[PDB]
Design a protein around this motif. Structure first.
Motif, PDB file in Angstrom:
ATOM      1  N   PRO A   1       4.954  -8.095   8.811  1.00 61.07           N
ATOM      2  CA  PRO A   1       4.396  -7.513   7.586  1.00 61.07           C
ATOM      3  C   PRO A   1       5.015  -6.208   7.110  1.00 61.07           C
ATOM      4  N   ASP A   2       4.885  -5.946   5.810  1.00 64.74           N
ATOM      5  CA  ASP A   2       5.386  -4.709   5.207  1.00 64.74           C
ATOM      6  C   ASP A   2       4.252  -3.680   5.233  1.00 64.74           C
ATOM      7  N   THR A   3       3.030  -4.194   5.322  1.00 65.41           N
ATOM      8  CA  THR A   3       1.820  -3.380   5.325  1.00 65.41           C
ATOM      9  C   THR A   3       1.860  -2.143   6.213  1.00 65.41           C
ATOM     10  N   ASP A   4       1.597  -0.988   5.606  1.00 68.52           N
ATOM     11  CA  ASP A   4       1.557   0.284   6.327  1.00 68.52           C
ATOM     12  C   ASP A   4       0.162   0.398   6.934  1.00 68.52           C
ATOM     13  N   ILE A   5       0.032   1.218   7.969  1.00 68.84           N
ATOM     14  CA  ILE A   5      -1.255   1.450   8.603  1.00 68.84           C
ATOM     15  C   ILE A   5      -1.766   2.773   8.038  1.00 68.84           C
TER      16      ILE A   5
ATOM     17  N   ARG B   1       4.296   4.270   8.415  1.00 69.05           N
ATOM     18  CA  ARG B   1       5.169   3.343   7.707  1.00 69.05           C
ATOM     19  C   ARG B   1       5.554   2.129   8.545  1.00 69.05           C
ATOM     20  N   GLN B   2       5.534   0.966   7.908  1.00 66.68           N
ATOM     21  CA  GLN B   2       5.887  -0.290   8.554  1.00 66.68           C
ATOM     22  C   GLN B   2       6.717  -1.047   7.534  1.00 66.68           C
ATOM     23  N   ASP B   3       7.589  -1.930   8.003  1.00 71.42           N
ATOM     24  CA  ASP B   3       8.424  -2.702   7.096  1.00 71.42           C
ATOM     25  C   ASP B   3       8.859  -3.990   7.763  1.00 71.42           C
TER      26      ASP B   3
ATOM     27  N   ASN C   1       0.797  -1.221   0.000  1.00 75.99           N
ATOM     28  CA  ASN C   1       0.000   0.000   0.000  1.00 75.99           C
ATOM     29  C   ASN C   1       0.832   1.275   0.000  1.00 75.99           C
ATOM     30  N   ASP C   2       2.152   1.141   0.100  1.00 74.26           N
ATOM     31  CA  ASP C   2       3.021   2.313   0.073  1.00 74.26           C
ATOM     32  C   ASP C   2       3.645   2.492  -1.307  1.00 74.26           C
ATOM     33  N   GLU C   3       3.353   1.555  -2.206  1.00 75.44           N
ATOM     34  CA  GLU C   3       3.868   1.593  -3.577  1.00 75.44           C
ATOM     35  C   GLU C   3       2.737   1.518  -4.593  1.00 75.44           C
TER      36      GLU C   3
HETATM   37 CA   LIG Z   1       5.502  -0.547   4.217  1.00 80.31          CA
END
Ligand SMILES: [Ca+2]
Length: 496
Positions: free
Chosen positions: A374-378, A232-234, A217-219
């Motif tokens: 997860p890579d998923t951003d909040i 941001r999360q990674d 969701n950040d790309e």
């Molecule tokens: Ca991310």
């Protein structure tokens, strides 16, 4: 003083950090989710979980102190950056101060929304914070946002991750929407106005709801265009047991198809009332028949699990088709065990349907950075909020909010259109659009449904079928520890 580094840390505080228990997102999320109709924490033996679950906490509440202490800590850090850059007037530094002041305003909103007051402090020092409550606090937050607006980036002109004018306007819309609660004086006109300013911005609705909560969701532009403020999360770099890791791992258990992670904590599941948001008649919910046995072997691969689920029409995609709403991202399938919709006693993760709204899979099918985190951003701030806020504001003013509501239901490919907006339909739409995003409680309170008999959901107030609690629970108590440590603060009405 490393201006750049402190600036960066300001934003980082939203998604990084018992340590795993006290993060910014997890503590606010729990106070706004665990006591509501959207979910339940499966391990009631965990300290203070029963209290938060049934709205029966007290001033000694550990989870109330966690969110309280965390919010204040973040603000002390924002106050530091602000004192260190005070008086400076270059374009970039002003922009940085505006964004930091926006983050502080956001934190003060949490205090206001959760406690109705806050231990106020404008600068970084050792003095005791002084109490700023209700209207006074409300006005302070509104003023801050009003002042910093001009120094911020234009909508979608800021580097992804940083807050822009729209972020500013959306928070103001939310504050105005809740003005009645915070100041005792409604201001639905303003809520509509600022909501319209956000809807009038460059941001646009993602055409595929689920993509908003996916690993890329950040790309993914389709998702980014709607994400006004991402945390941001990674998988490898930005880890937090209370970040997206919480939303994915906490909602899965071994056996479920496409877990997206190696660790399923089996902690968070949906209450029956949450499921009802997509199925008025709970009998319409796709479920495995009681007389169909679940095999003990042969259900290992996702293909084997999907095959069984498909035969009985219980794959999540089957749940979605039955609900006629893309948002019904729930799982009643066999992976993980026979599920129940409602339970006579909270005994475990399967006493309710699983929620698979958050996923650690990219929309483009490419690999994610890690196997467990997860890579998923909040997407803390989403354009959709503007539509629901304007829809409610318009409704309250006596106007016709069907157009705004329909915009969201059209995006979700809903088969059921809302012809006439009603209070019940509105609060139910807030649930369907934002469940498991940490805001439920605030909306319930605004609707006068959080503690009263106006709306009862399973396990509310500790009762199987739900019951009301004292009205003073519409506000969390000031941690007893701060009361004894800061004579400037006074406990909230109702508590002892
Ligand atoms: Ca991310």
């Amino acid at each position: 003083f490393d201006q750049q580094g402190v600036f960066v840390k300001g934003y980082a505080m939203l998604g990084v950090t018992d340590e795993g228990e006290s993060g910014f997102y997890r503590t606010t999320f729990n106070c706004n989710e665990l006591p509501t109709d959207e979910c339940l924490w499966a391990w009631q033996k965990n300290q203070d979980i029963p209290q938060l679950t049934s709205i029966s906490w007290s001033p000694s509440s550990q989870r109330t102190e966690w969110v309280y202490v965390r919010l204040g800590y973040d603000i002390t850090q924002y106050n530091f950056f602000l004192d260190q850059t005070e008086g400076m007037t270059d374009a970039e530094t002003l922009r940085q101060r505006a964004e930091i002041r926006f983050l502080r305003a956001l934190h003060y909103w949490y205090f206001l929304d959760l406690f109705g007051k806050a231990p106020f402090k404008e600068h970084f020092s050792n003095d005791l914070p002084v109490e700023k409550k209700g209207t006074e606090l409300y006005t302070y937050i509104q003023n801050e946002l009003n002042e910093i607006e001009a120094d911020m980036y234009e909508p979608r002109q800021a580097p992804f991750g940083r807050a822009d004018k729209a972020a500013n306007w959306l928070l103001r819309a939310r504050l105005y929407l809740n003005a009645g609660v915070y100041t005792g004086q409604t201001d639905y006109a303003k809520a509509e106005e600022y909501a319209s300013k956000v809807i009038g911005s460059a941001y646009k609705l993602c055409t595929n709801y689920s993509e908003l909560f996916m690993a890329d969701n950040d790309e993914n532009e389709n998702a980014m265009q709607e994400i006004i403020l991402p945390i941001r999360q990674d998988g490898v770099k930005t880890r937090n047991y209370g970040g997206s890791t919480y939303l994915v791992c906490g909602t899965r258990v071994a056996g479920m198809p496409r877990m997206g992670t190696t660790n399923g904590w089996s902690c968070i599941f949906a209450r029956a009332a949450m499921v009802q948001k997509f199925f008025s008649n709970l009998e319409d919910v796709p479920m495995l028949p009681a007389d169909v046995e679940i095999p003990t072997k042969g259900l290992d691969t996702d293909e084997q699990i999907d095959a069984f689920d498909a035969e009985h029409g219980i794959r999540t995609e089957d749940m979605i088709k039955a609900a006629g709403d893309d948002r019904a991202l729930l799982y009643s399938g066999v992976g993980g065990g026979r599920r129940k919709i409602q339970t006579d006693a909270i005994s475990g993760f399967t006493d309710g349907l699983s929620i698979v709204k958050w996923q650690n899979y990219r929309s483009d099918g490419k690999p994610v950075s890690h196997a467990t985190y997860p890579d998923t951003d909040i997407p803390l701030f989403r354009l959709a909020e503007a539509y629901l806020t304007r829809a409610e504001a318009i409704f309250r003013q006596g106007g016709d909010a069907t157009g705004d509501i329909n915009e969201l239901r059209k995006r979700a490919n809903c088969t059921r259109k809302v012809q006439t907006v009603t209070e019940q339909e509105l609060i139910d739409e807030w649930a369907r659009e934002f469940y498991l995003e940490g805001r439920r409680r605030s909306d319930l309170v605004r609707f006068g449904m959080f503690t009263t008999n106006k709306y009862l959901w399973d396990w509310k107030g500790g009762a199987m079928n739900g019951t009301s609690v004292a009205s003073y629970y519409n506000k969390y108590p000031i941690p007893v520890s701060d009361i004894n440590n800061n004579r400037n603060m006074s406990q909230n009405e109702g508590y002892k």
